[PDB]
């Protein structure tokens, strides 16, 4: 299957064929295909010729064509009347391709030049459930405003989703179809919303009016405010008939007042986005809060008053009325202290599991207040000013197809929250953890203390008040490991991340003690990456009866092993239950044979990539019966073993990309399902016949003489072995040949 990778399932077959440098649509496309993917190519012409009696095709993706306009022939797709989804994004169009099929349910024309939405190109469409027209006249192109001729949509009676964001409309278009469920109009330069704007949209569940009269604060053009920094103006009766509304986005509309009356007839509102407005007032005395007993997510982030740095956050009593609230986002309100009384209104909300107070520059917090909550699972306090526990103004400056407006990535890694209540204190000033640092905290399972300039010597008492932490993140600090009892008070610890604490490890004379590792009975994952460890004090071996994974990259094994009295010859041996080991980025030029033999026999996965090894004693693989993955990418390897099977019976994956292998020997030979030989120095592959699902080869300098026949043969016979990127497997020589994919070859002249 070339050049498109025909993948199968589920209950339909698709031809993955994008980003292959195509100038055209291959005709040689397996019949009876559900849909085709042709995004990210150089195609420039779409025509009747283009799709011939495909018939079967339901979906077509032609986005990003070409990667520098796109020419399309009227009625080009009509030959396909089973076409339901058509994607034409980033194709630089200046009009809605005329003559479009009526079988379309979904049509995307995002990121194009279309400034006129018309009945000729649209109204026929009829079966459209989803229509996307975002990013066409987003000043400038140049483009004054988007023009929608009156009634273009009313004939689309099955229209469930209409997206017109990032287009200058000035006014909401009339004659909208009552079937609408989602209406996106973010950044449409609409300043006034009238009573009649959404008159008959009785089925709306989502309305996005964000970025209209934005609060540009600390941003330049294309961010453009309404004259005099005025907020969007919404009529009192603008939403009286939108009783099905679940999601309302009013982020960055420069609102100062929220009219409670807008919500009288909106009992189902689950999500309300009010980020990037000027609502500190409303937050203190907002009547609109009494109208939302069913709200689950309220985002009030970045509503700070420039230059204001109040002592306390002023949260209205009415917050107590948001009985269905599950998450409250209060980033960037900016205040100095959080007292138990300040959060009174929220202590009764039964479903509140997430409180986000990131970026508030809070100096003090009465932590006992968190114990008075029914369901907190996530306490996000990153980027605050908590100090070790023994003003009047401030200068805070803030600086797709995607959004919601809140960094949709989770607040805490999921591998961490999964264990329980999570507390994030990263990016604070806990440069030293005091004796009462964590007093009065609920039972925390997940804790992040990353990036706090902490240079202390942990001694075994710092976490006595929260001894049930399972996942502890101590990355990016300058901890001084000079006490064997460090962290032993966390008997339940399962994941410990000490990455990026190189500062004391680098200094000669300072002592380093990692003995605490063995004291944990349930420790599973330990990451000591990027610590430049090159010596240990007194106790030279890491040991754990439980540890399963050890990430030791970015340290200095070259020094620990490559020199010495064999002090660290058995450094990892005592990791009796280890299955994964990362030794990348350790500047290894040579591994002592006994050093390698002492790695735990229990290993199933070993990474040694990105070192500088030139030889590898394969024979050593004999002592690793359970070894399934072996990674050696990014080295300087020269030769391969001639008898691989006399050493391994379990190896399944072998990664050797970015090496200096120039000759693949006889064989091999095997449980080996994956082999990566991409980016090496293979001029050609000698016959080497024969159970493997994948073989990577792009990047080698192949010699395209008739010798490329044995191999060329090989592939033809085995379409059962995936060769990702055949397109990139290229001829290095000879010169007429060079640059040509080893399959494009006009072999015939070979006779
Ligand atoms: C210190 O060292 C530790 C340990 O290695 C690092 O933490 C690990 O980080 C790795 C890499 O981020 C994590 O692996 C990732 O896990 C994600 C979540 O997995 C869960 O959910 C999936 C399905 O979503 C299940 O399959 C799975 O069993 C888990 O329940 C995955 O989503 C990630 O995606 C992977 O697969 C996709 C396939 O599409 C690929 O696109 C990705 O590239 C990737 O291969 C990935 O598997 C691992 O969870 C971490 N361990 C822990 C305990 O957190 C630290 O980050 C490191 N510290 C620093 C600073 O580097
Ligand atoms: C204003 O707030 C709005 C209310 O939340 C925001 O609306 C959201 O906008 C985002 C981005 O445009 C949409 O997210 C996308 O959704 C599609 C659809 O995926 C569907 O299928 C997947 C299966 O994989 C499923 O998991 C989803 O739940 C969907 O059913 C995705 O394909 C995209 O990758 C992306 O996630 C939201 O869907 C949309 N919310 C809703 C409820 O429709 C809006 O973005 C905000 N405005 C701005 C300017 O930020
Ligand atoms: C602890 O918080 C830190 C800081 O926010 C997180 O580290 C960042 O992680 C993100 C995404 O993984 C990266 O884009 C940043 O570069 C990281 N910054 C720093 C300072 O390291 C970290 O992921 C958090 N840890 C957990 C377990 O949630
Ligand atoms: C819109 O709201 C007004 C308010 O009186 C009401 O009279 C009208 O019936 C509503 N329209 C629809 C279609 O529900
Ligand atoms: C504890 O929570 C309840 C609300 O559930 C509240 O009445 C009480 O005042 C809180 N305790 C303190 C000390 O704030
Ligand atoms: C909210 O909390 C109540 C009481 O703990 C629980 O019964 C309910 O299921 C929770 N709501 C959701 C949506 O999980
Ligand atoms: C570790 O720290 C504890 C508390 O400071 C201390 O009592 C002990 O002497 C230190 N040294 C060792 C090796 O445990
Ligand atoms: C940790 O293990 C070492 C060596 O077995 C032992 O000396 C020490 O008492 C242990 N520490 C704790 C807190 O259990
Ligand atoms: C070995 O690792 C496995 C997998 O996490 C774990 O279940 C087992 O308890 C570990 N062994 C010991 C001795 O803790």
């Amino acid at each position: 299957s070339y050049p498109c990778d025909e993948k199968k399932q589920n209950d339909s077959v698709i031809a993955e064929c994008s980003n292959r440098r195509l100038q055209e649509v291959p005709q040689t496309v397996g019949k009876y295909v559900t849909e085709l993917d042709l995004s990210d190519n150089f195609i420039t012409h779409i025509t009747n010729e283009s799709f011939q009696g495909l018939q079967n095709l339901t979906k077509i993706n032609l986005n990003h064509n070409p990667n520098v306009g796109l020419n399309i022939t009227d009625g080009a797709f009509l030959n396909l009347k089973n076409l339901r989804e058509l994607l034409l994004e980033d194709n630089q169009l200046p009009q809605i391709p005329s003559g479009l099929p009526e079988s379309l349910t979904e049509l995307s024309l995002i990121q194009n030049n279309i400034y006129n939405i018309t009945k000729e190109g649209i109204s026929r469409l009829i079966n459209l459930k989803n229509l996307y027209l975002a990013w066409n006249c987003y000043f400038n192109k140049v483009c004054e405003k988007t023009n929608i001729e009156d009634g273009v949509f009313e004939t689309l009676t099955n229209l469930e989703l209409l997206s017109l964001s990032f287009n200058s409309l000035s006014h909401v278009p009339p004659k909208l179809p009552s079937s609408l469920r989602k209406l996106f109009l973010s950044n449409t330069q609409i300043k006034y919303i009238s009573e009649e704007d959404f008159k008959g949209l009785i089925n709306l569940t989502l309305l996005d009016l964000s970025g209209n009269c934005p609060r540009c604060f600390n941003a330049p053009f294309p961010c453009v405010p309404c004259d005099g920094g005025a907020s969007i103006n919404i009529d009192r009766f603008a939403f009286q008939n939108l009783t099905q509304l679940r999601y309302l986005n009013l982020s960055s509309t420069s609102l100062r007042k929220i009219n409670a009356a807008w919500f009288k007839n909106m009992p189902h509102l689950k999500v309300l986005d009010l980020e990037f407005n000027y609502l500190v007032g409303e937050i203190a005395s907002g009547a609109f809060l009494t109208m939302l007993p069913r709200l689950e997510i309220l985002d009030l982030s970045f509503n700070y008053i420039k230059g204001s740095y109040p002592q306390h956050i002023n949260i209205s009593r009415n917050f107590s009325k948001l009985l269905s609230l599950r998450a409250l986002h209060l980033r960037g309100y900016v205040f100095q202290e959080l007292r138990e009384d300040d959060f009174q209104p929220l202590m009764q909300l039964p479903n509140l599991s997430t409180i986000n107070l990131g970026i508030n520059f809070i100096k003090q917090i009465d932590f006992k207040l968190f114990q008075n909550f029914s369901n907190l699972e996530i306490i996000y306090l990153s980027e605050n000013r908590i100090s070790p526990l023994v003003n009047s103004s401030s200068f805070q400056r803030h600086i797709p197809h995607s959004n919601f407006y809140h960094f949709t990535r989770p607040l805490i890694k999921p591998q961490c929250a999964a264990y329980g209540k999570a507390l994030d204190l990263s990016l604070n000033s806990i440069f030293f953890i005091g004796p009462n640092q964590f007093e009065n905290l609920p039972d925390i399972a997940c804790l992040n203390l990353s990036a706090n300039s902490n240079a202390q010597v942990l001694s075994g008492t710092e976490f006595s008040a929260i001894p049930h932490v399972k996942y502890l993140d101590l990355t990016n600090n300058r901890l001084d490991f000079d006490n064997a009892s460090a962290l032993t008070e966390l008997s339940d610890l399962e994941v410990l991340d000490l990455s990026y604490n190189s500062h004391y490890f680098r200094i000669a004379g300072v002592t380093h003690h990692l003995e605490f590792i063995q004291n944990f009975t349930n420790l599973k994952v330990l990451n000591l990456s990027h610590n430049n460890i090159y010596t240990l004090t007194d106790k030279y071996n890491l040991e754990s009866k439980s540890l399963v994974e050890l990430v030791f990259s970015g340290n200095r094994l070259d020094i620990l092993w490559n020199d010495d009295d064999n002090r660290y010859i058995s450094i990892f041996k005592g990791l009796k239950n280890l299955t994964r080991l990362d030794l990348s980025l350790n500047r290894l030029k040579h591994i002592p044979n006994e050093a390698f033999l002492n790695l735990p026999a229990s290993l199933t996965e070993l990474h040694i990539n990105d070192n500088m090894l030139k030889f590898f004693n394969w024979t050593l693989l004999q002592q690793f019966p359970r070894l399934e993955l072996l990674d050696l990418r990014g080295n300087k390897l020269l030769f391969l073993t001639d008898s691989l099977s006399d050493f391994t019976s379990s190896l399944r994956t072998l990664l050797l990309s970015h090496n200096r292998i120039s000759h693949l020997p006889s064989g091999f030979l095997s449980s080996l399902k994956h082999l990566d030989l991409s980016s090496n120095l293979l001029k050609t592959i000698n016959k080497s016949a024969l159970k493997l699902s994948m073989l990577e080869l792009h990047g080698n300098p192949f010699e395209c003489t008739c010798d490329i026949g044995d191999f060329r043969r090989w592939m033809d016979e085995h379409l059962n072995v995936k060769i990702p990127r055949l397109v990139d497997v290229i001829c290095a020589s000879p010169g007429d040949q060079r640059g040509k994919s080893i399959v494009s070859l006009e072999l015939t002249t070979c006779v």
Side-chain angles (χ1 to χ4, degrees):
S1 55
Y2 177 111
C4 313
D5 299 22
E6 300 183 5
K7 193 65 177 182
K8 50 289 181 179
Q9 253 253 357
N10 48 5
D11 311 11
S12 41
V13 173
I14 186 285
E16 302 178 12
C17 199
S18 59
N19 195 29
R20 282 90 164 97
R21 293 188 283 263
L22 319 198
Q23 315 278 156
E24 63 171 354
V25 179
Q27 292 60 346
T28 70
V29 40
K31 313 84 62 181
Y32 67 94
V33 174
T34 314
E35 53 176 328
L36 177 73
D37 181 25
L38 299 175
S39 61
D40 298 346
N41 287 323
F42 300 112
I43 296 180
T44 173
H45 286 112
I46 291 305
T47 187
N48 261 125
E49 158 201 326
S50 304
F51 303 96
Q52 293 198 162
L54 297 297
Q55 334 175 307
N56 278 170
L57 302 199
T58 54
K59 292 64 179 178
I60 301 176
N61 189 358
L62 297 165
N63 298 327
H64 306 282
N65 284 2
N67 300 161
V68 62
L70 177 62
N71 179 353
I72 300 176
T73 162
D74 313 22
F77 306 100
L78 292 38
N79 182 181
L80 331 189
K81 159 62 203 314
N82 297 19
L83 188 67
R84 295 181 297 182
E85 188 177 0
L86 181 60
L87 305 179
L88 299 173
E89 303 176 20
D90 212 21
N91 286 336
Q92 219 91 27
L93 316 211
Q95 296 300 9
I96 307 174
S98 305
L100 264 157
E102 303 193 352
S103 57
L104 290 179
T105 57
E106 181 182 1
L107 179 64
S108 185
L109 300 179
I110 318 192
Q111 247 174 319
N112 281 322
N113 293 305
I114 301 175
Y115 311 112
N116 191 12
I117 300 300
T118 66
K119 314 188 65 172
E120 177 182 353
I122 285 309
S123 313
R124 259 66 129 320
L125 270 329
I126 292 305
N127 291 27
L128 286 173
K129 286 191 174 64
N130 302 339
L131 178 58
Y132 299 93
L133 300 180
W135 298 103
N136 287 233
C137 181
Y138 190 56
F139 69 84
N140 306 164
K141 294 309 303 77
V142 169
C143 178
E144 53 178 0
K145 298 71 177 181
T146 275
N147 179 74
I148 295 162
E149 205 50 56
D150 165 300
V152 194
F153 304 114
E154 65 177 0
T155 74
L156 299 171
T157 63
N158 299 4
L159 192 62
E160 290 177 340
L161 183 175
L162 178 58
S163 174
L164 295 181
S165 293
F166 300 100
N167 286 318
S168 46
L169 307 190
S170 294
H171 299 268
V172 177
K175 312 298 69 178
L176 288 162
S178 64
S179 57
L180 281 177
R181 295 195 295 191
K182 296 178 175 174
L183 178 61
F184 298 89
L185 301 168
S186 189
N187 291 113
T188 55
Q189 293 181 113
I190 300 181
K191 161 61 181 300
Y192 180 79
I193 298 297
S194 63
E195 170 180 353
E196 303 294 34
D197 285 310
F198 313 116
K199 215 211 318 170
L201 303 175
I202 61 175
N203 290 303
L204 274 190
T205 53
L206 181 161
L207 180 61
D208 185 0
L209 293 172
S210 52
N212 292 306
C213 294
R215 164 166 172 168
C216 289
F217 273 61
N218 289 138
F221 185 100
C223 190
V224 184
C226 286
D227 294 352
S231 74
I232 188 176
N233 181 121
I234 309 178
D235 186 17
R236 190 192 186 283
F237 303 106
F239 307 126
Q240 69 172 170
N241 289 344
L242 279 39
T243 69
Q244 304 306 310
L245 206 70
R246 272 64 179 175
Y247 301 91
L248 181 56
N249 194 343
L250 293 174
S251 295
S252 190
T253 52
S254 302
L255 286 162
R256 288 173 175 78
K257 295 203 300 293
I258 299 293
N259 193 355
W262 303 311
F263 304 106
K264 284 195 168 192
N265 307 343
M266 191 181 298
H268 305 274
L269 195 65
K270 288 202 288 286
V271 180
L272 175 63
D273 284 312
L274 292 165
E275 321 150 35
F276 312 116
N277 288 298
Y278 302 95
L279 301 167
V280 172
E282 286 292 1
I283 297 177
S285 67
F288 81 99
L289 292 164
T290 61
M291 309 292 292
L292 303 165
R294 209 302 171 185
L295 195 71
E296 295 181 12
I297 299 180
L298 179 59
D299 194 336
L300 285 163
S301 298
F302 301 106
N303 279 259
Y304 66 91
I305 299 170
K306 331 76 203 180
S308 187
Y309 184 47
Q311 282 193 328
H312 305 100
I313 179 173
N314 196 2
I315 297 298
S316 176
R317 285 182 171 271
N318 299 338
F319 267 77
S320 71
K321 298 190 183 306
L322 300 166
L323 299 180
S324 309
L325 200 66
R326 305 189 192 179
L328 179 59
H329 297 282
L330 279 168
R331 293 197 308 180
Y333 174 102
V334 194
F335 61 105
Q336 309 175 42
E337 185 178 358
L338 184 67
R339 302 176 300 181
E340 189 163 6
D341 288 342
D342 299 318
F343 267 29
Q344 190 71 196
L346 306 170
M347 288 172 290
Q348 65 188 235
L349 306 181
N351 295 127
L352 184 55
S353 47
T354 290
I355 290 173
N356 183 358
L357 289 171
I359 316 175
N360 276 295
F361 308 99
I362 299 171
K363 300 186 177 180
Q364 286 183 328
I365 290 184
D366 185 1
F367 288 99
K368 65 171 57 183
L369 76 78
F370 294 114
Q371 287 174 338
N372 198 7
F373 284 84
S374 318
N375 287 321
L376 283 181
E377 288 299 304
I378 291 179
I379 308 178
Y380 192 76
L381 293 169
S382 190
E383 305 186 61
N384 282 288
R385 308 212 66 196
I386 281 57
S387 321
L389 298 171
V390 175
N391 309 2
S392 309
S393 176
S394 184
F395 178 86
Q396 165 59 183
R397 54 172 173 175
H398 175 75
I399 69 70
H401 221 287
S402 96
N403 247 174
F404 272 114
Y405 268 131
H406 211 264
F407 308 159
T408 197
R409 48 203 185 161
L411 298 182
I412 313 302
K413 289 186 59 178
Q415 299 81 333
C416 195
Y419 290 101
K421 305 186 196 305
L423 174 58
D424 194 323
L425 282 171
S426 66
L427 298 166
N428 280 263
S429 299
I430 305 171
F431 65 90
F432 156 67
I433 287 160
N436 300 319
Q437 196 69 48
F438 309 126
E439 301 302 343
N440 303 333
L441 283 174
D443 184 18
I444 294 306
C446 164
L447 183 69
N448 196 353
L449 291 171
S450 184
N452 278 282
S453 308
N454 181 331
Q456 76 183 121
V457 168
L458 291 173
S459 51
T461 66
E462 300 71 23
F463 300 95
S464 66
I466 52 179
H468 311 297
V469 172
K470 301 293 187 64
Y471 192 122
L472 178 60
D473 189 336
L474 286 182
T475 64
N476 208 8
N477 278 294
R478 14 177 96 171
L479 298 162
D480 182 1
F481 293 97
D482 196 34
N483 182 303
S485 301
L487 304 164
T488 57
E489 66 282 42
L490 297 174
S491 48
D492 301 333
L493 196 70
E494 297 178 29
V495 183
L496 180 55
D497 191 3
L498 304 176
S499 294
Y500 297 97
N501 279 290
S502 48
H503 171 95
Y504 289 103
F505 285 103
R506 298 181 179 279
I507 306 170
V510 32
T511 49
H512 318 282
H513 295 273
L514 296 184
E515 300 81 346
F516 60 88
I517 291 177
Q518 46 167 104
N519 289 126
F520 304 103
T521 65
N522 197 39
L523 178 64
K524 302 171 185 175
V525 180
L526 176 60
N527 187 341
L528 301 176
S529 68
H530 307 280
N531 286 319
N532 298 232
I533 298 173
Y534 73 96
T535 181
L536 299 181
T537 305
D538 299 333
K539 211 268 175 148
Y540 316 113
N541 304 299
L542 306 184
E543 297 178 352
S544 181
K545 293 181 177 180
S546 60
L547 192 65
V548 158
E549 178 183 1
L550 179 64
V551 178
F552 199 83
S553 65
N555 287 295
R556 309 276 326 243
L557 269 180
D558 59 333
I559 293 169
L560 291 159
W561 292 317
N562 296 190
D563 309 339
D564 207 77
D565 246 24
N566 300 147
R567 228 152 223 250
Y568 312 100
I569 211 64
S570 305
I571 192 173
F572 309 114
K573 186 180 179 63
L575 297 175
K576 295 297 176 61
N577 194 4
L578 195 70
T579 61
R580 287 71 65 82
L581 182 58
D582 179 347
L583 306 183
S584 48
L585 290 169
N586 276 248
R587 307 178 192 183
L588 290 168
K589 291 176 183 293
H590 173 261
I591 303 181
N593 291 328
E594 189 191 7
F596 191 103
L597 290 177
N598 284 330
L599 300 177
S602 54
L603 293 183
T604 75
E605 180 176 352
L606 175 54
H607 295 255
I608 310 177
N609 47 305
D610 285 329
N611 274 285
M612 325 152 93
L613 301 175
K614 282 179 179 171
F615 307 103
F616 180 83
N617 188 328
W618 299 93
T619 309
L620 300 173
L621 297 185
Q622 292 180 351
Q623 306 302 348
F624 298 93
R626 292 178 291 188
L627 180 59
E628 303 186 33
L629 192 178
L630 173 50
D631 179 358
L632 299 175
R633 304 102 78 193
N635 283 259
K636 280 162 165 175
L637 296 171
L638 298 169
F639 80 104
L640 287 174
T641 186
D642 53 348
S643 56
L644 200 181
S645 180
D646 297 345
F647 316 126
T648 178
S649 311
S650 58
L651 187 58
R652 298 179 59 266
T653 312
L654 182 55
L655 310 180
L656 303 172
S657 50
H658 294 274
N659 278 286
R660 294 173 182 176
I661 292 177
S662 59
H663 174 82
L664 201 176
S666 305
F668 321 117
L669 293 164
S670 292
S671 46
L672 212 155
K673 297 188 172 188
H674 187 132
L675 175 65
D676 177 4
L677 293 166
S678 52
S679 298
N680 285 244
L681 298 172
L682 293 173
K683 292 172 69 187
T684 181
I685 310 189
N686 288 190
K687 37 283 138 156
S688 265
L690 164 267
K691 284 184 167 58
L692 66 67
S693 307
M694 184 173 295
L695 179 67
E696 309 185 28
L697 295 169
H698 71 102
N700 299 249
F702 291 104
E703 184 172 16
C704 291
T705 61
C706 287
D707 293 326
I708 207 64
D710 300 25
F711 174 71
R712 176 51 165 277
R713 161 188 284 283
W714 181 276
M715 335 199 327
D716 195 357
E717 293 181 336
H718 304 92
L719 292 64
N720 48 326
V721 307
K722 179 68 64 178
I723 303 296
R725 302 175 66 182
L726 286 167
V727 184
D728 290 328
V729 178
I730 292 178
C731 296
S733 63
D736 24 306
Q737 242 43 300
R738 161 173 241 244
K740 258 186 157 178
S741 165
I742 68 176
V743 291
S744 165
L745 282 186
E746 16 57 316
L747 203 68
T748 63
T749 310
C750 181
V751 172

